Amino acid sequence: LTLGNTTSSVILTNYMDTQYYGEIGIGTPPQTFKVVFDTGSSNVWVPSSKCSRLYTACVYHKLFDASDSSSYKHNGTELTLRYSTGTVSGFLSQDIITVGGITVTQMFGEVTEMPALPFMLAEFDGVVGMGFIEQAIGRVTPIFDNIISQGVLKEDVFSFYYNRDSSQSLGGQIVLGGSDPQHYEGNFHYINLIKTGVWQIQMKGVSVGSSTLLCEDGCLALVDTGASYISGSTSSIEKLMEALGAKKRLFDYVVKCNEGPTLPDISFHLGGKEYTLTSADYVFQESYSSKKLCTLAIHAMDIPPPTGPTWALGATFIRKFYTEFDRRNNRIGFALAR
Ligand SMILES: COCCCOc1cc(C[C@@H](C[C@H](N)[C@@H](O)C[C@H](C(=O)NCC(C)(C)C(N)=O)C(C)C)C(C)C)ccc1OC
Numbered sequence: 601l602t603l604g605n606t607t608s609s610v611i612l613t614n615y616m617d618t619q620y621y622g623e624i625g626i627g628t629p630p631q632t633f634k635v636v637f638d639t640g641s642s643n644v645w646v647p648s649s650k651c652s653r654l655y656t657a658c659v660y661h662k663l664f665d666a667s668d669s670s671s672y673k674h675n676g677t678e679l680t681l682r683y684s685t686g687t688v689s690g691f692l693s694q695d696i697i698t699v700g701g702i703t704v705t706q707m708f709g710e711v712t713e714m715p716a717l718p719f720m721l722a723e724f725d726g727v728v729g730m731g732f733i734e735q736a737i738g739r740v741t742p743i744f745d746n747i748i749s750q751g752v753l754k755e756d757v758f759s760f761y762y763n764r765d766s767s768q769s770l771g772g773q774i775v776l777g778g779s780d781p782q783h784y785e786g787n788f789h790y791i792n793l794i795k796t797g798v799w800q801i802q803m804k805g806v807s808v809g810s811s812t813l814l815c816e817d818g819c820l821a822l823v824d825t826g827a828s829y830i831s832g833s834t835s836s837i838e839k840l841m842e843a844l845g846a847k848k849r850l851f852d853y854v855v856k857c858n859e860g861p862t863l864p865d866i867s868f869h870l871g872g873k874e875y876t877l878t879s880a881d882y883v884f885q886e887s888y889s890s891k892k893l894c895t896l897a898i899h900a901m902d903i904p905p906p907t908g909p910t911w912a913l914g915a916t917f918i919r920k921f922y923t924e925f926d927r928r929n930n931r932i933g934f935a936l937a938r
């Protein structure tokens with residue numbers, strides 16, 4: 601590990617508080633793509649110009665065309681990426697990628713099969729996995745490992761800032777090689793990784809209102825920058841939602857809008873601190889009418905072993921807590937976002 605003097609930032613766009621993505625350039629000349637920097641996975645991929653137009657998601661997104669890049673290097677190994685809410689398939693390719701001023705030769709997947717659900721609902725084109733090589737499909741070296749190999753980043757860490765963006769403001773920000781003191785206050789508090797190669801930590805309990813109603817025996821929390829909400833197993837969530845008086849729909853839970861401001865606080869016991877969210881933090885309070893339903897930013901999601909079962913702390917959590925991902929010391933640090 602050779603540290604340097606550099607830190608780079610990528611400005612992110614906030615789409616309706618559910619999708620946070622930035623931009624990257626691939627090839628020569630650069631072909632730009634909107635990508636989610638996802639700590640939940642470790643591969644980089646973008647739709648390919650070889651994706652059948654019968655996949656409507658390929659008709660609606662930017663496609664990488666190897667035939668227009670002079671820095672492209674062929675590989676072709678098949679690759680299938682299975683995420684908890686969708687799958688993409690294609691083959692491996694290599695080219696130079698620019699991420700916030702840093703230029704790195706990276707192997708990424710050219711996706712040729714991209715399902716309408718959920719990709720037709722994606723504002724982003726692709727993904728830049730921020731996880732460890734242990735979780736990389738095909739054992740492909742993750743982009744951050746490749747940047748760290750260059751010995752330019754001041755620190756072997758990267759940080760996330762997600763705004764409550766609502767027209768002339770910064771949707772979010774990723775800092776490669778450190779954090780931005782301008783977006784958090786107080787001190788960072790850390791929790792060591794409960795495992796090797798996954799941004800997952802031990803969670804001591806989850807409380808709703810008065811007491812620790814859930815995760816009483818301890819549980820796992822995966823800090824997922826590529827997730828819109830805080831999710832837990834169906835069991836946990838049914839019990840949580842029971843406590844909230846929320847009603848279960850097909851893909852989410854709602855509450856009569858007038859009841860929203862009434863909902864209790866929900867805390868997550870991580871390491872030495874309690875991380876508390878008020879209803880305002882987890883309710884999409886779009887109305888105060890008892891005649892309208894307001895969705896909650898907390899969902900049920902069952903991740904299978906060996907990673908799951910596990911809670912996933914997504915944008916709902918990150919919006920309140922600036923997050924630093926420390927590879928050097930295998931821990932995650934949270935600070936109050938500002
Ligand atoms: C915060 O805004 C980011 C985008 C949110 O919106 C979407 C997120 C996804 C899923 C994420 C990916 C997940 N965050 C994923 O990383 C979750 C993890 C996962 O499935 N990882 C994949 C691997 C292969 C590592 C695995 N199965 O373990 C789980 C283990 C938590 C995208 C980056 C593809 C799909 C569609 C979306 O909007 C239309």
Ligand SMILES: *[C@H]1O[C@H](CO)[C@@H](O)[C@H](O)[C@H]1NC(C)=O
Binds near residue numbers: 676692
């Ligand atoms: C492409 O990539 C892998 C490394 O992930 C390499 O070792 C493999 O042999 C390459 N194959 C081809 C056909 O280029």
